[PDB]
Design a protein around this ligand. Sequence first.
Ligand SMILES: *[C@@H]1O[C@H](CO[C@@H]2O[C@@H](C)[C@@H](O)[C@@H](O)[C@@H]2O)[C@@H](O)[C@H](O[C@@H]2O[C@H](CO)[C@@H](O[C@@H]3O[C@@H](C)[C@@H](O)[C@@H](O)[C@@H]3O)[C@H](O)[C@H]2NC(C)=O)[C@H]1NC(C)=O
Ligand SMILES: *[C@@H]1O[C@H](CO)[C@@H](O[C@H]2O[C@H](CO)[C@@H](O)[C@H](O)[C@@H]2O)[C@H](O)[C@H]1NC(C)=O
Ligand SMILES: *[C@@H]1O[C@H](CO[C@@H]2O[C@@H](C)[C@@H](O)[C@@H](O)[C@@H]2O)[C@@H](O)[C@H](O)[C@H]1NC(C)=O
Ligand SMILES: *[C@H]1O[C@H](CO)[C@@H](O)[C@H](O)[C@H]1NC(C)=O
Ligand SMILES: NCCc1ccc(O)c(O)c1
Ligand SMILES: NCCc1ccc(O)c(O)c1
Ligand SMILES: NCCc1ccc(O)c(O)c1
Ligand SMILES: NCCc1ccc(O)c(O)c1
Ligand SMILES: [Ca+2]
Ligand SMILES: [Ca+2]
Ligand SMILES: [Ca+2]
Ligand SMILES: [Ca+2]
Ligand SMILES: [Ca+2]
Ligand SMILES: [Ca+2]
Ligand SMILES: [Ca+2]
Lengths: 395, 398, 395, 396
Amino acid sequence: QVEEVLKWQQVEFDVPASVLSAPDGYIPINNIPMSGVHYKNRVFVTVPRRRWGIPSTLNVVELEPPYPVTNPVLKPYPSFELNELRADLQPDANRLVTVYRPRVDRCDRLWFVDTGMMEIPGNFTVVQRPSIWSIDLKTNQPLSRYEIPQKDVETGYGLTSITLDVDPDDCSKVFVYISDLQTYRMVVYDHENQKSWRFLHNYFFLNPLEGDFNIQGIPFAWDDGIFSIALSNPDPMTKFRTAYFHALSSNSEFTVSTAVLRNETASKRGYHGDDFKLLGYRGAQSQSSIHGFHPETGVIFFALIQLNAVSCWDTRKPFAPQNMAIVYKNDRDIIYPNDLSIDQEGNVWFMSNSIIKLLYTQLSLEEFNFHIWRANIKEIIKGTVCDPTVPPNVD
Amino acid sequence: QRQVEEVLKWQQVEFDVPASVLSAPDGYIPINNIPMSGVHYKNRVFVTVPRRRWGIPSTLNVVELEPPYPVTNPVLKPYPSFELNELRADLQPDANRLVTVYRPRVDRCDRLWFVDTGMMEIPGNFTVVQRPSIWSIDLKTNQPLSRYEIPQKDVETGYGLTSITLDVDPDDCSKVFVYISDLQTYRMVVYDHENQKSWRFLHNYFFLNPLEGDFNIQGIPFAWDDGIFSIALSNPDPMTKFRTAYFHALSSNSEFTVSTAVLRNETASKRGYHGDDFKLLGYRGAQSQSSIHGFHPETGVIFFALIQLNAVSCWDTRKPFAPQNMAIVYKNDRDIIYPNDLSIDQEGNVWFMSNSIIKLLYTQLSLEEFNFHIWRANIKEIIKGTVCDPTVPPNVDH
Amino acid sequence: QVEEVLKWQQVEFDVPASVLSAPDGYIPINNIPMSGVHYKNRVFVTVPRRRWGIPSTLNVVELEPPYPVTNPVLKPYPSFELNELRADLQPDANRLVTVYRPRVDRCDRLWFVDTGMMEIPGNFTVVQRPSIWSIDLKTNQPLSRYEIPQKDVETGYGLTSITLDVDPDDCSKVFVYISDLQTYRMVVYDHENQKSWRFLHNYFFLNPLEGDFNIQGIPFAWDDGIFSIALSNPDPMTKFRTAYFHALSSNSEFTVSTAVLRNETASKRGYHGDDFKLLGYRGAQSQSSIHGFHPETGVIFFALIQLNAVSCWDTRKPFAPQNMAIVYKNDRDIIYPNDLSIDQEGNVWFMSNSIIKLLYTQLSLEEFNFHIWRANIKEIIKGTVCDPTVPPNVD
Amino acid sequence: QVEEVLKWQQVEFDVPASVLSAPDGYIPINNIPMSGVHYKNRVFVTVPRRRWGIPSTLNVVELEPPYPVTNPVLKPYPSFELNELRADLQPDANRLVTVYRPRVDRCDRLWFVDTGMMEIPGNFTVVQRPSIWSIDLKTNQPLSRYEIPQKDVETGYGLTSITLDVDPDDCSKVFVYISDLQTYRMVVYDHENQKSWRFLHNYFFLNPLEGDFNIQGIPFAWDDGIFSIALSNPDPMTKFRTAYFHALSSNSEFTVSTAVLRNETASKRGYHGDDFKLLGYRGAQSQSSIHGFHPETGVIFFALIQLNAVSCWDTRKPFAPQNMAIVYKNDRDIIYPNDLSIDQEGNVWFMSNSIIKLLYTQLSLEEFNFHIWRANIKEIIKGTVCDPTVPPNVDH
Ligand SMILES: *[C@@H]1O[C@H](CO[C@@H]2O[C@@H](C)[C@@H](O)[C@@H](O)[C@@H]2O)[C@@H](O)[C@H](O[C@@H]2O[C@H](CO)[C@@H](O[C@@H]3O[C@@H](C)[C@@H](O)[C@@H](O)[C@@H]3O)[C@H](O)[C@H]2NC(C)=O)[C@H]1NC(C)=O
Ligand SMILES: *[C@@H]1O[C@H](CO)[C@@H](O[C@H]2O[C@H](CO)[C@@H](O)[C@H](O)[C@@H]2O)[C@H](O)[C@H]1NC(C)=O
Ligand SMILES: *[C@@H]1O[C@H](CO[C@@H]2O[C@@H](C)[C@@H](O)[C@@H](O)[C@@H]2O)[C@@H](O)[C@H](O)[C@H]1NC(C)=O
Ligand SMILES: *[C@H]1O[C@H](CO)[C@@H](O)[C@H](O)[C@H]1NC(C)=O
Ligand SMILES: NCCc1ccc(O)c(O)c1
Ligand SMILES: NCCc1ccc(O)c(O)c1
Ligand SMILES: NCCc1ccc(O)c(O)c1
Ligand SMILES: NCCc1ccc(O)c(O)c1
Ligand SMILES: [Ca+2]
Ligand SMILES: [Ca+2]
Ligand SMILES: [Ca+2]
Ligand SMILES: [Ca+2]
Ligand SMILES: [Ca+2]
Ligand SMILES: [Ca+2]
Ligand SMILES: [Ca+2]
């Protein structure tokens, strides 16, 4: 029902031996994949440069059964020329420094944010400013690039997550919502008018008490804020969408109309009033990392961090723990769910990268550390409370 | 509880009507007169006595407020006149007379709205005198403005038309919609005032919850099968200019919502399947079966009249609908037997009433004790500091 | 083990051509069979007049291998003279207007209720008052006919199900419990004394949330209440029986002693107190239409509407989903299980009529729309949880 | 029994006219006092440089009847030479740029932190690095100055609150705890060994839902974190104390032993474990700004922002709303309680500067905008639940 598609012990790259032979040109243990997204027969894996020895940040893998695919070699996408890291570390608009979590739209495009910053412990290296890319997945040729001005974000330290808002009619009308979990803000990007603005709010911050975890018997505490944003279907009368968002270190979900996020004048306000709302409580130890909204079913899938599971919620039902169901739970393999995406085929994709083991213990490249799963949405929710046909619980 | 005033109180209800009507046999019976309403306008309070039995001289009445409070055993004066409240012995349909009136509503336009069921629910002999009709009375002149007979296509008799909710346009006042709650046939009948048309909605959510229909008030057990009973409207949405209709059944601990954009849609009423238009809001709480509830435009707070808990609770509509995001503002197990009515005036007060209907139906009603109570509470003051206060933030589980 | 016995693409009647040739005397699409019962290797099929062009409401079919028999012609029972429809539409005590679900007892008698009402969309026509019938199945001669008084039920709109309570010794001592899913009541009928009374309770109502269905991708909601009643064997001590009843739109099962249902003075109460009991939750999407109790095995067979299946339960085991088993499931054929009955031969009979396709979509007469199955009870429960010898999954 | 000591319509300085005449030297409405602290008939009033036109940041006022003293002229302390702002805005270790809330100890010294930064709307000007000062109140001569290294704090943007931990025996043994409500951290200062270290923790952050205020009909929302710290009495031997701390936008109080804060090795941890504890919920709309702990009675006094009041709590009774009492409330005068201090004379001092009026509306220099009160602690709590002799209202 939920098949493991890709798994790695460590990450290898399809690059010249010149890069592998060079000193500090490739360290296996430093290469941690932070994203896995699906398109056609291609899965894009990203390796953010949070360490030294990372040949390529944006990569791609060709799917071929049987699953699970063992240690697929990452091919630098779109090309290794772009994923080449300059020794001088100087700004270049035709290079990719660090890419976290890309998203695929209906227009056969790949959207991602190049932070332009390497978060090496000790040496924070800001190579260039953060930029928002779009790639044509049909030609494999970059379509647009937008450098984010200083007035919106300083460095792009926390720009690790993006949400696409594409008009159902015109494919040119696109808005992108970036979650900064470091600076506790939301960067809005107007693709049509090539403008951008930032939103500052208290709800983007964590919950002090809900920031402590214990995974794989490893205790830790994070102060990470807004991390993920999920969009509902357009309102028939208003044409606007409801943005479900939450902080990493939070058991609470919040909502806001895109009418507000698409309003540049609203961003500059010091007080946003009652525009941002509290949805409700997701549940004990129900801290989510990434979540996505399925347009067909109207079901939001949450990547639970502490519970090592993936849950779902039918947006039509009241937001409560008893109106949510766990569709998959794996305490052995799912250490930290680093990514969750919904593809154009009606599948839910989620990933674990065992990042906790690297941070607080030793990671062993003998074990399979990196896992990617997929599950058919309509089939996984069939019997559960997430099925729209199934009524909500009485509690 | 220490800032809620009792305004009116009765042991028995009497009437300022001709002695010819009071003297006549079965023209006035003391124990049969049970008021089901208490609404405030300016300096007077409108009390209704539905003819659920015999000996009911008048249904719609009015009382002038005058200290000291509470006013003991006020005489109910037929409104607008006794000529309209005089029951015909022939029992023929009277298009200019009032048979049975339950729960009136007052709007901002100085009008009084109510529904004349035209039906007397006497135990043993159900008498349908005429068809159900909606009224509008000018409170300045005390003259009836309009009367609309509800077609058979919408309601059969009007047996359960004991609740009304007004939807007046914030801009114009001639544009009016009325939502009537039928707790007997389990439906909502919609009335378009300007176009003088009406239609009905049928839905499963208008029914009761089989398990949540048992009560025990004052040590008197009973069960009711009453459905959709009360509707409360939010402020018009700034973008769509529509409202959210909070509605619940009497025998249910659940609250539901629906956009007035659906209710105002005549073609949508004739559908067999309404789809996801009607949604479940959430669980109000254990033993939290409500009778009548009202929404205060200014604060955005809903006051529920809790039947089993013999109390009145409030809820900020901005906060998620949850037990911990609700507070009890007033509780009185002695006086509040059954909260029969709850209304929100134009003066920023919440009015609620108990009529001890249970003690008449299932036990003995004593005219030696006070059985009927009307209360008033300032909304902004009663919520100040509570979770009902919009300025106060919502709570969480942990 | 479970074999299809009868199946129709449409239903035809063996009656004078004069009736078929008459103006709108027979419309193929309007004739929907609502039941199928087995007695002495005979099958009685009923076609309630919920439309125009329905020659006969009560019919019979002779069983003859091989099975399934394709498109058997319905034979009016007991004769066409009774099933004839009067043009003047006046009440006739010796005629059958509308019959839903007949039942067979151990005393070789056929019980059914003529509603005397035609539920045509546009013109609800009440021909006559509802009447309960008894037929001697050995002589095919009517035995008894009782008109239900207005004090008990008004129109007989929702009298579509009956349960027989015959004394194990005397065949004259008979009580019949009718289920009114429209007015939400239970009509009790005392055969011996020729009296009757009604019961009103909250438990006869539906559950608001549990009324939404989606069969064959067709969404719809029904407000139908108490629909079926099943009687256990007499208690060895008090000789009273447990009446298991449920609403159509509900996942909950209820119980009440027949001592209460047989009690006319208890009928006149406004409050029944603690007399009616909640048995428990049958399961998610486990809304049942008709159910029967098998005296020999003490097993109840439920006709699941949403699951398109037939389940069983051992009454001795605690009423829980884990203590129930699905004995037959057929998403292709079983759209709506319109009837389920337990014959005298130790078989469970169930039927599907594709009613929803008529109401919400269009019914194709080129496909088989009407199905009747039979299954040996002792053999079907052998290796399941419904087997009395097998212990429960949940204490 | 609570008396108003000082009240201003606007702040004026005792400085040469050459400074007040200077271009953008003295803009009245930009001069907002942020602290009023007491010492032997002297009140030290500070005016942080959050805007242009502020002659002196650290000032003093001599107390003399009758009270309340109307529009006292601020006198630069210890002198104008130190408070004078350089026109070239270059770093100078003998200059005071911006001081917020000074604190007085038992050893007759005045502690405060010069942020060295001007938080001017538009262009935040960092003149110099933040420094921790001590002044002898007997000689009015600066005793010590310690520049805080970049390893601990970036600029000193949020260093607006300090808590003194002086050893009961030796006056030379001092620790200072600095609350940074902007970078959400606590800076520890070792005075004896002239070292310093920072602390990061989730509890220093605000509570998202508890950040919205409505004062004087003025709606606003703040994201400010750990803002105040209060110290209990020291253990008779180990001389460790309990540090009661809270964020500005929070209805929760938190505790931590000084044994942890005084531990430099513990500061460099990435996970502090259960060392920082949650005390409990202070009450609805009970967001506190500054609070202090009175050694004698053991009572903490909270400055309530939203309730426009001052509440107390006995540190022996369980931390719960019904175990706390409002000793003073004034919706008219108390707009934003900007500072609260406990003196060596057994009085509680609190102040309101109407900061929100300047921020979100207009400030009238015809109205009294700045207020400073005092109250005898043992007298104000006499009957209340805050009295140690009075029993608690709930067991909790
Ligand atoms: C884009 O957002 C702009 C700023 O945000 C608005 O103002 C806030 C105070 C809130 O009202 C918020 O909901 C709203 O988005 C805004 O320029 C613009 O429209 C605003 O909509 C306001 C809705 O109330 C409305 O405010 C008006 O002005 C303020 C100063 C007060 O006087 C209000 O009583 C008055 O209604 C106004 O249309 C406008 N507000 C402002 C500040 O300009 C919004 N975009 C669109 C298309 O509406
Ligand atoms: C009244 O109800 C009908 C219900 O069918 C609404 O109809 C539909 O609207 C969309 C597009 O407008 C159409 O695809 C479907 O047939 C919907 O059901 C109708 O809009 C509504 N009328 C109004 C304006 O309230
Ligand atoms: C900071 O960076 C220095 C540069 O070192 C080199 O950087 C790149 C080119 C990698 O190849 C790396 O392996 C090289 O060492 C480091 O020498 C220095 O140690 C770094 N400082 C810290 C504190 O991490
Ligand atoms: C505090 O500092 C570290 C952190 O726990 C620890 O090693 C040390 O023992 C503690 N206290 C001291 C200084 O002994
Ligand atoms: N993915 C780890 C990001 C992180 C977590 C906790 C922190 O305190 C922090 O500064 C950064
Ligand atoms: N307030 C009495 C309304 C009521 C309650 C139960 C019933 O069965 C009924 O017909 C009517
Ligand atoms: N099963 C058909 C009977 C039925 C179903 C639903 C209804 O709403 C109704 O009035 C009648
Ligand atoms: N004067 C209070 C400081 C403050 C409050 C809220 C903010 O969002 C902020 O940046 C600064
Ligand atoms: Ca694929
Ligand atoms: Ca962080
Ligand atoms: Ca008045
Ligand atoms: Ca009823
Ligand atoms: Ca047989
Ligand atoms: Ca029905
Ligand atoms: Ca801040």
